[model samples]
Target chain A: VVGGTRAAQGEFPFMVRLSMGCGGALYAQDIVLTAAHCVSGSGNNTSITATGGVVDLQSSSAVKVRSTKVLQAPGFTKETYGKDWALIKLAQPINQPTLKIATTTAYNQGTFTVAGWGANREGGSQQRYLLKANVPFVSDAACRSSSSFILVANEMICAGYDTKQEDTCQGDSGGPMFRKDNADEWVQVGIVSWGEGCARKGKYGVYTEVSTFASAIASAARTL
Target chain B: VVGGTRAAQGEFPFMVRLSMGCGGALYAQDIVLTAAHCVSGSGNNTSITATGGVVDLQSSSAVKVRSTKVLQAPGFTKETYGKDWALIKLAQPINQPTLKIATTTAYNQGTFTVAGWGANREGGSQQRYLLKANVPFVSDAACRSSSSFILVANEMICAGYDTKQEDTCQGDSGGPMFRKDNADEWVQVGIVSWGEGCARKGKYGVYTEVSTFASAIASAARTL
Candidate 1:
């Protein structure tokens, strides 16, 4: 989170903090959804600890679980080029909440809440507690037109204030960009991928559009 | 929680929501400390389920465990009279974080954090997510002078704004009134016991002074 409010205990129950200074979301009981760039080309990642159940990094209530392996997006080049999502399998099942994936692009637009134990400012130190900020969805015409970065139609989405500075910064990569659905249940819409800089003027935060990769994520989750 | 902010995931890892609409704290691997009024006098309580890991009542990540037995404070009266804490033994151990009890009163006078899935206002509906508020500890003289209720020294303590309206409400009883100690680790100082009414003008939220019973709680926890 950048230019975000400090989150309270159990607010984002599905949120997970990767020991590698990345963020993730609980996709299943034993699987975590994150950014492909956050991990090397998949395979065994036993060194990673997926911490959940609390906002503060030092909270005693936090549940830390070890990772067994990771499955990154196939043919993914980099965050800017798309295919920037991944799934990590845990050593054991965690009882924390899992975020649901949006199957349709209907939720791609509108305001979304992004949370992570990331830096509050560009190049700043990582936070001790989870932080959150709300950013409105940016259309391809607006996002692509704003910068020289490529925006693959459904593969990527942009979110951030056009005039303000509420955006995810470093260390937030692979975390969740979510919102309450029609039923008021939290559903993930995007994954923290990249941006020109943290909360830069006229620069929007880019994310891996989860709805576009819902099927792949669901399939990978089941296999993991 | 009343007049409190919504808590984030893992903010209070030791918090436990009892099925009886009361709240508690993870005392040990398989023991929960709560208000004696929240359970029956020292016996099997197999019907109760202890929910943890999430703030939302309906969160999928919430972990629930069945109660095998409970140890209520011996010779305890009602919440107003004191001796209103208890410990519940779980059928199976949960890996969630547990809270440390205050062994001394040094940390009892400062501001404290109180949390629960309680009502937001007087006679209001119970909340779906856990809420938290900061309440300054009320002195013995100030609290005893507020109402006609008896205030047993060392057995009871009060916390809440005498001028503002930030106090725990219904369904919050048995939850924790904790603060970070000198080491910045959470140490519970009180247990929600009683009060005149929810967020009243003159009345304050009274809690079982945990430090006074720390020895008893620790001793009972080992046996459980």
Candidate 2:
């Protein structure tokens, strides 16, 4: 929901959009970290396209690269999202300074910024431009307060404004939730995983708390 | 270092002292989460003792318990100290309500509270009563800035004031570095793992981020 606004081109250089699937972060020169559910069935070949270097999909400077390979986190399943993350090997490495994966679980309670090309509204059409939003971290109590269907797993985080004005929606899953640290460097905190809907009352979007899976991400990125 | 502060008895009920070794967190009624380095020799037998329910180690109210077995996180090594986590199986389950493990890496930049019966100063005598202190999370770059062997590994966090105000010392290793959430419930975030010195200049204490090994904790708790 970058609060339903259009992100300027090149604002999020590392924010990569995966065609026919989900979003991803240019974690390394040749590695794209994303949600496991996003790349699970995208394919084994170069059918998946990774758009990088620009926020807007239609921008002329946007860099599109074919994915060379995809590997889902070990034991990642739709039923249990403890490892709801995946790594895609890019056919070519980009010059973009990759966002650093947090070695420490520095994510206390705060608003994390997320940019995505998801739908503006629930069941709405996917926006051509990237949308950015500041989603506040929600408590497990508040996240589970609304629906019995909403659950918090071992490796997830709940995020959305208390007012529910800003959030991620359909097609937002696999996107990066990042924060610029004291050093002004963008570090990825989580990945868009699931949610009830867009900006819905009493419901919050869920994400993969990336710090918990640093070892997996590191090993995956290093292998390719 | 819980510096210049003597914690009240049972103030940190979830804190456990692994006798003749390091500290730990009462993760469950029968399971204590600690550092793999701390329990390397305390053993596969019942030699490890866990003291809890009191801040003072020698107090009568302290619920001291022996461990049935010690299991380190798979692939853990002292040289790396990244997955420096282990679980102690209590010979008998205690009635004390255990501390909640952090679900999300709610650890971004924030002050964390740590308590232990470790030495008040580097290579000094261990405190009979628990000492407490608030340590700030250090930035990754700041943590790695030093040429003097500062590195943050997987499932790890660097915590302490940059000015070298307070930090974990010897015998504090494997102690719980915890925080009170928005709901005021104390959640164990990390296990005090290592440091260059006790509150030394340009040095900070490190811990194994607890959230990353939650699945391991859950499975270990349900078993021996």
Candidate 3:
């Protein structure tokens, strides 16, 4: 359930450590959703980590999961940055929140929030404690103006700030970017994909528009 | 014990893994040196692999080492992007001719070959076999213009083509970048550090200069 903090309550459910690159969250029961850019062409050797959240200074409360299967969106590319989404089926189902399907429609632009244990600052250290931030969704043109913006196409959405005072850094990739529904319920609208230089000014954090690929995600969830 | 590759038949020693974001090599032993950036700041959870050369695909031939300790460089900067190196102490020393140190100080700017089993392309798949590329040493101004220029500094040298056709992609980070000595010996001049984007044009592959920090490296090697 969504908690008082921007992130869902009961410790961060799923955190992934992709092979050498790529990182993400585990929203559904068995399906692990992350940025397509993470495991784009990677095969079986891609590594993953699923933990509750950071619980100690020495280490975080996480479990390493080796992926058995990786399903990336068909039209993924760094140019358009489209379809930057992927579904990873773990060798075993994790006991956590049941994966919810994203809707095809976009969420309202105002006061949306995302949560993760991403890097604390641009080119800085990855935070051990999960952090959250509130951001207003911006137009594609505005996001593109950022130095870090590498357009990935229609499947991608842009978020964060231009000033770089507060934005998602590393470690936030593939985490949830959600908006409140009409019933005041939080629905996932995007998945953290990539960004320009970890919060550099004018660089926007890109996310996979889950709403656009809702059907595919739902189908994948069911199969899982 | 140098094999008949190009120039030398003696021990081609002094290889190190220059830690990016922290100036130092993590591992040092006879013949070969380990990269510090590959294992540093990750709480000792980082892993590295070294293949003998190109065309060697056997897993057994590859040496994989995990970091046990990480030491930050004297003038390391977490923000400004220089002094990104570390010294690693391998769990075991590799007893081979390829792991020896350089016995000369003559540095020249010429075309030399560097090889690694790192990532094949930026944001692409990790290579299974060793990959090779012919690179020329260039000025800091020229090196900074390349895609992998993020971690380039005065203490480091740059090589590789920024274009997609040639590069030291993601998996190649922390590998050796070298040049031949006056005696036609392959002397290590750099270690693969960070890059802006893998295999993108106008981006040069950045590496830590072994000669620049030879004293520090030698001291660390002696201690290890």
Candidate 4:
């Protein structure tokens, strides 16, 4: 099992490429989690290719899949950027250890780590390898007060530094926010969801709390 | 009062452009009828430019207004292709009587006429001026069976031909769907939401039923 320290080692194994130049990550066997805005158009069905690292459409390590199903929160809107989580099911099961869902009901507000290969800056060069950062989870009211549309909904959690360079940015949507379990197991607690802008000051990175949709993820998992 | 026949004879008075490359019509001082998908993004505070039939965006006929609010049906979704309606509020009132909201509730199915600038084919050029066509309202179940997404929501009403060449296309996202009233008045019933493809056979067009969200519209109107 990958521990939180190993998972945050800034390596491969979490890179995802989506349609329309979007990118995210594979958090489970049948679930390819992503930002709601990335796939929010007329076409809900699109192709996703996941690899151990940054893989392209023709990479040998890449596994291609089509979005067979989608589950977006009913309360999502543009004004309140809450509930930014979406569960996308692949057409077939992947042959790998599926990322474990968080069973814990509570999490401590501490410095958690985030990993992804998103762009270094807005329209900057895409990071070729995974990057890691440590940030604390802040209160929802405080996050919402900072932006007009960046509300922290039930499905969303807030993290990042108000004065630091480490943060999630464009192309990091649908990545993982894992927490170290008591048994040293790295459990995914959040899905890299959305934020104001890439690494903007006073704007922390937000994610979809996995605990909020455990039943929905389990229901979707049973079908596969 | 505008009748379906009279409304179709020439052109609509107030035309507004949405951010998602769609256009709508202002039928009242506070009521701007647009497609549900137009407001279906991650931000709530949307701005629209209301204009006359002039094609250019940088002309004096354009009236700029921020969307004071939006009202969508509970069943709208990108998967099921649910009702595609949203009532928008203008920042300021328009002095023209050309845009008037219908006051009556009664509606007849077959006597209605719809108008839009959508193309007859996907990726085709949009019609230079407004185009009119007569359409029949379809049952929810029937619309679902015939559509790819299975349009099952109650707040939606389907129109257009199931096996013909008449329908709304890619560019006509938030046009008007009107029904003739008892006093020869054309009441806005639905807003052009989305379809499987532009004018494709066996696919019907879906719209947001204004009657379902009337209270939300009225409430939003009062604020403006």
Output the number of the TM-score-best candidate: 3
lDDT of 4 by residue, B1-224 (tens): 00112233225556555533466777675466676566532123333334443434455655555554455434444324455656666557655444444433455255456765555565454454556677888767777888655554656777777676776666577777776666665677777776666556787877766676666556655654
Ranked by TM-score from best down, the candidates are: 3, 1, 2, 4
Pick by lDDT: 3 or 4, better one? 4
The CAPRI category of model 4 is incorrect
Interface RMSD (Å), every candidate: 21.3, 23.4, 9.0, 13.9
RMSD of each: 17.5, 21.5, 10.5, 17.3
Task: Name the candidate that leads on DockQ.
Answer: 3
Q: Pick by lDDT: which candidate is best?
A: 1
Candidate 4 docks with a DockQ of 0.02
Residue range A1-224, candidate 3, lDDT tens digits: 01112444444455444432334666655567876655423233223434433322235444455455556666554423477677777766666554343685657355556776556665345444556777668777777666343564567777777674666656566667776677755677778766655555666667777888888766655654
- For candidate 4, give fnat to 2 decimals: 0.00
The true-versus-predicted C-alpha distance at residue B121 of model 4, in Å, is 32
Error of 2 at B10 (Å): 2.2
Where in model 1 is the C-alpha error above 4 Å? Answer: A1-224
List where candidate 4 sits over 4 angstroms from the true fold. Answer: A1-15, A41-59, B1-224
